[model samples]
Target: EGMQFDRGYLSPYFINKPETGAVELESPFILLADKKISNIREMLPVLEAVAKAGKPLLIIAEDVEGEALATLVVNTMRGIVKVAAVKAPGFGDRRKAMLQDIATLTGGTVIMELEKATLEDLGQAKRVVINKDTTTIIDGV
Candidate 1:
């Protein structure tokens, strides 16, 4: 099957609500830099947070490829927490703006700038739906 990835790629949340084109998540999610994840375990607690959260937990990671990316894909698929990994372009610049906007909307913090991250540091999306470009993060309950 010719999966037109570049145009249709998005998180589970958007897959669920194709019409809304938007959803709000709760405040407080985690940010994971590519270097921050050498082991999958470091993400466990954060994943768990989404399961217990009142809303969908958002995770913004550096838009990197390779093993780390694969790890996130696999685990996110099976992870108990209702997690959505928002791929950002590295830790700064234009990409950071989108991530920052999400954090602000959700009332969350971007942890990559911090010295550490924990499940408690995670935040939810005040709304995560589709964008004009259909990028994920639609409005929610």
Candidate 2:
């Protein structure tokens, strides 16, 4: 069961500016990987104009299927710009697989485990490796 909705500081619509960025949006953990919008055909003209400006575009999707739209947008502009995707952590293996497929097909990187990364780790990551496991152990002496 869930708590009843109430008009308080911790309301469901509460926004945390410091935690997020200038455009802060939050949703339930369960719905984190759900797609809110589909069929971005209307935005093509605007995207074309923006692409013509020769500026890098950053696209983020909550769901794996959303990558199809991102791919369309990137491909429409003649593949001159770069595309990036951020996948939800709680997504299942299937969703992660789909996301990785899109990233590989479109020359993008799927950024997972960003929450556990430190600033130093990110800064020092010149080359990223995937699908390789390493273990670190601490033993009491």
Candidate 3:
């Protein structure tokens, strides 16, 4: 069921790049959130956690903008952390189901608040590729 999208290439809403090449991440940690992340304060901890782990990050949230997105882009560019953000898939009840599918696939917990998130709450994927128009998660847990 959830295995069907192991190599799924879902469209990305935004990517922090100056050009069009796809970003390939190996063993990146994924974050599945049901709400928008607009505050940098809510994002720093997760960034620090992912940074300490020495792995890239793939964030799937309702939306990512303002301070959070801005900071992420800078860090990505500065090589402080490698990260990508995408909109959560589906809508309404279906959205929750798809988010759960991703959570199940990556062994993560879907969260509504970033303030209370722990490293264990993040998902794990074997590989991820982020293109201008699509993002793919492969060999997820």
Candidate 2, run of 10 with poorest lDDT: 132-141
Name the runs in model 1 displaced over 4 angstroms. Answer: 1-14, 17-38, 64-72, 75-81, 89-92, 112-120, 130-133, 136-141
Q: Residue 124, candidate 2: how far off, in angstroms?
A: 21
lDDT of each: 0.45, 0.30, 0.76
| TM-score for each candidate, following the candidate numbering | 0.52, 0.28, 0.83
- Model 3 is weakest, by summed lDDT over 10 consecutive residues, at 1-10
Could you tell me the lDDT of residue 115 within candidate 1?
Answer: 38
Q: Per-residue lDDT tens digits of candidate 2, residues 36-141?
A: 2245553344345434644333233453335445554455346443322233323567556654543443344545333332222111111111111210111100
- Across 68-132, the per-residue lDDT of candidate 3 in tens digits comes to 88777776667666788777767799888989998998999999568878789999988877775
lDDT of 1 by residue, 1-141 (tens): 110111222344333334655323334354534333445555556555455654454445664345644665665467433444445543457556655565554445565433355554544433543233433433311
| Distance from true location, Cα of 27 in model 3, Å | 0.4
Q: Tell me the RMSD of model 1 versus the true structure.
A: 7.2
Which candidate would rank higher by TM-score, 1 or 3?
A: 3
